[PDB]
Amino acid sequence: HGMKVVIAGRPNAGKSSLLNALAGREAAIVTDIAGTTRDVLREHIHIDGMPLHIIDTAGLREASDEVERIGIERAWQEIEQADRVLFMVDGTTTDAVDPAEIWPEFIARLPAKLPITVVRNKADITGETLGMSEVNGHALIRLSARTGEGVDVLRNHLKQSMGFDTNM
Amino acid sequence: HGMKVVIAGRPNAGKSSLLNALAGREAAIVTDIAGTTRDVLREHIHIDGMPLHIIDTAGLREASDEVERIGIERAWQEIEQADRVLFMVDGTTTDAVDPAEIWPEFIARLPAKLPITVVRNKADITGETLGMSEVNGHALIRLSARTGEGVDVLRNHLKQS
Numbered sequence: 001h002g003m004k005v006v007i008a009g010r011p012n013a014g015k016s017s018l019l020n021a022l023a024g025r026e027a028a029i030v031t032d033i034a035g036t037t038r039d040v041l042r043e044h045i046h047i048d049g050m051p052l053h054i055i056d057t058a059g060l061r062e063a064s065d066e067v068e069r070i071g072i073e074r075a076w077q078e079i080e081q082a083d084r085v086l087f088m089v090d091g092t093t094t095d096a097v098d099p100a101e102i103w104p105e106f107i108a109r110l111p112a113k114l115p116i117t118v119v120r121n122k123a124d125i126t127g128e129t130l131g132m133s134e135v136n137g138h139a140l141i142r143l144s145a146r147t148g149e150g151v152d153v154l155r156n157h158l159k160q161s162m163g164f165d166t167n168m
Numbered sequence: 169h170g171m172k173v174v175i176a177g178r179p180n181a182g183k184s185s186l187l188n189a190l191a192g193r194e195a196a197i198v199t200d201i202a203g204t205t206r207d208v209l210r211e212h213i214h215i216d217g218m219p220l221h222i223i224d225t226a227g228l229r230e231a232s233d234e235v236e237r238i239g240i241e242r243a244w245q246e247i248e249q250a251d252r253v254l255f256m257v258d259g260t261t262t263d264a265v266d267p268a269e270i271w272p273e274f275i276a277r278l279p280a281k282l283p284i285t286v287v288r289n290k291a292d293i294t295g296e297t298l299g300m301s302e303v304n305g306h307a308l309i310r311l312s313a314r315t316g317e318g319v320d321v322l323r324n325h326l327k328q329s
């Protein structure tokens with residue numbers, strides 16, 4: 001059961017690290033090498049009983065080999081079918097918070113009704129204030145997938161935003 | 169719930185192809201490049217009502233690529249914890265059917281008593297008679313993960329076993 005949250009963004013942003021933080025398990029390989037993840041990885045999790053599918057994808061860039069090209073094509077296929085996208089941003093590589101200043105082509109390609117949460121990762125390095133805010137109507141979260149600081153704010157956000165109804 | 173079936177073997181054996189055949193979707197990326205799969209891939213399926221976790225792994229070898237090396241260590245970790253291993257052999261690379269001939273080091277490393285099914289893949293290229301047999305007490309299945317021929321025999325085997 002549960003809605004689909006897709007984690008997407010540039011290589012090395014910390015997407016698999018976030019998947020692992022959310023799954024509470026080393027589900028995905030994490031290294032400092034861009035293009036570590038190629039296959040789509042999915043974890044089914046629960047937050048206070050609410051089921052949720054978390055989907056980790058290949059970092060989006062010009063592909064360095066055929067496998068990574070296919071992983072990126074599949075990433076877009078998952079984004080297109082997502083219920084929400086977590087746009088993961090390496091906070092050390094940009095100071096911009098509005099995703100139109102970060103990567104407008106990414107934002108523009110997203111399906112019309114698809115909600116996006118901007119996740120500024122690596123707050124442990126940048127020293128940004130942890131937690132939730134808003135920018136141009138998008139949820140904005142600052143956290144560290146590596147240390148786990150601020151990931152509870154994301155969990156609460158997913159709890160509050162990814163709900164659905166059901167019966168027998 | 170459901171038992172854990174781990175598909176394991178050399179690179180390019182057709183492990184991800186078999187995952188995709190069993191899962192009925194393009195769950196894993198398939199190419200002719202050794203070391204395509206590195207992360208462990210898991211698909212929960214039901215076969216005629218029976219729940220199974222089918223687990224696809226990095227082809228086993230001494231890899232140079234750091235990520236493939238990690239995937240191979242993780243493949244061994246899955247094998248260690250499996251309820252059955254499907255040992256996939258590329259039928260085009262050997263006529264041998266006994267896994268002791270094919271790759272004794274692999275068979276010897278498996279947990280004591282972990283059941284192993286030898287799967288001779290690429291029967292569409294070799295012309296081998298599809299279906300189930302046995303070798304030295306091991307189940308042996310000849311099939312083509314690409315065309316799907318003989319995969320029904322594997323499905324029935326998993327249900328039975």
Ligand SMILES: Nc1nc2c(ncn2[C@@H]2O[C@H](COP(=O)(O)OP(=O)(O)O)[C@@H](O)[C@H]2O)c(=O)[nH]1
Pocket residue numbers: 010011012013014015016017018029030031032033034035036037059121122123124125143144145146147
């Ligand atoms: N300092 C710090 N490093 C991080 C954080 N999140 C990820 N990393 C590192 O960034 C690199 C890439 O992480 P990974 O999860 O593989 O990125 P992906 O390619 O987007 O999946 C790895 O060296 C991670 O350990 C973080 O919050 N803080």
Ligand SMILES: Nc1nc2c(ncn2[C@@H]2O[C@H](COP(=O)(O)OP(=O)(O)O)[C@@H](O)[C@H]2O)c(=O)[nH]1
Pocket residue numbers: 178179180181182183184185186197198199200201202203204205227289290291292293311312313314315
């Ligand atoms: N002709 C034929 N090719 C196959 C079959 N199964 C896999 N292949 C090919 O073998 C290559 C490796 O397949 P793949 O599933 O990625 O191998 P893996 O590394 O073991 O996962 C690919 O080019 C596949 O299309 C088969 O049954 N018949």
Ligand code: ALF
Pocket residue numbers: 010011012013015016033034035036037038057058059060
């Ligand atoms: F660069 Al990656 F998963 F390794 F997006």
Ligand code: ALF
Pocket residue numbers: 178179180181183184201202203204205206225226227228
């Ligand atoms: F060589 Al592979 F999955 F690509 F075992």
Ligand SMILES: [Mg+2]
Pocket residue numbers: 015016017028029036037056057059
């Ligand atoms: Mg990754």
Ligand SMILES: [Mg+2]
Pocket residue numbers: 183184185196197204205224225226227
């Ligand atoms: Mg594979």
Ligand SMILES: [N+]
Pocket residue numbers: 011012030031032033034035036037
């Ligand atoms: N990475």
Ligand SMILES: [N+]
Pocket residue numbers: 179180198199200201202203204205
């Ligand atoms: N492959």
